Amino acid sequence: ATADTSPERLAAIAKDALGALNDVILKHGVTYPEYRVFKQWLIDVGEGGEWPLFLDVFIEHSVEEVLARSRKGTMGSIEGPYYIENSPELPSKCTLPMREEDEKITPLVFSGQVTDLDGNGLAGAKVELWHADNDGYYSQFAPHLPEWNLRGTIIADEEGRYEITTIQPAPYQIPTDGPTGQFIEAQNGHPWRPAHLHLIVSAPGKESVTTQLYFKGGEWIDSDVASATKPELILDPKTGDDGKNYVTYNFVLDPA
């Protein structure tokens, strides 16, 4: 992993990042017992392997807020720690891989079209979906699950449309008996995320979008610990007489 940044830019970055922190210590009168605790917690983050967690919850929102200024298409959001590459491909209309345990849960049917800025249909266009199960587990992040459970690469047809069936997600709680959750708990916070789909959407000759979609009445909707939920990405699914929840949603892709 490399940035291709200059020493001039880094220097300016670190000066005000360090200036900022050093400024919070002065402003609040941070003591020496406090400093020791802090240092000890940074070691633990590393030792608990919680660096992508902590940063993704607490920092990635600004990185996407920056990228967000540059694009005219669908609203993006943070990737989070759990994306996996080359998930198995599925046809234009499909079901997401899932176990019998998953078959017990109210289904979600997710339809729409991948278009360009003008609104034209895009063939040979892909939707990478992934999200958590009713337990708040992600596959490849819990040994009891099959390695592509609720992950897939959806191949959109002739005109960019896709119809995808999966389950309807339940609120993810981030891990707590570790440094990130001890961080939240010592400040009387809450370790909850909204229920969400993660998606990378692409198509030839387009700047991909990475985003999330959420659910209209959901808990933790206006208190996302990751600060990653927007108005523009909240679905409002209607239920069929089959009893399955139904949503349509379209992705608008910028020029690459």
Ligand X SMILES: CCCCCCCCCCCCCCCCCC(=O)O[C@H](COC(=O)CCCCCCCCCCCCCCC)COP(=O)(O)OCC[N+](C)(C)C
Q: Which residues bind ligand 3CE (CB under 6 A)?
A: 53, 56-57, 78, 80-82, 172, 174, 193, 226, 228
Tell me if 198 sits within 8 A of 129, measured CB to CB. yes
80 binds, among Fe ion, a second copy, ligand X, none (CB under 5 to 8 A by kind): Fe ion
Q: Is 28 labelled as part of a ligand binding site?
A: no
- To the nearest whole angstrom, how small is the minimum distance from the Cβ of residue 198 to ligand 3CE? 6
- To the nearest whole angstrom, how small is the minimum distance from the Cβ of residue 20 to ligand 3CE? 21
Interstrand relation of 93-95 and 161-167 (parallel, antiparallel or unpaired):
parallel
Nearest CA among 90, 162, 82, 94 for reference residue 122: 162
Tell me if 235 sits within 8 A of 247, measured CB to CB. yes
Residue ranges binding a second copy (CB under 8 A): 1-5, 7, 9-14, 16-18, 20-37, 39-40, 42-43, 45-47, 51-52, 55, 58-63, 65-67, 183, 186-189
- To the nearest whole angstrom, how small is the minimum distance from the Cβ of residue 215 to a second copy? 26
Tell me if 193 sits within 8 A of 173, measured CB to CB. yes
H/E element, 219 = none
256's tokens: 């690459």
Q: Counting contacts by CB under 6 A, is residue 17 touching ligand X?
A: yes
Residues making up the binding site: 138, 172, 196, 198
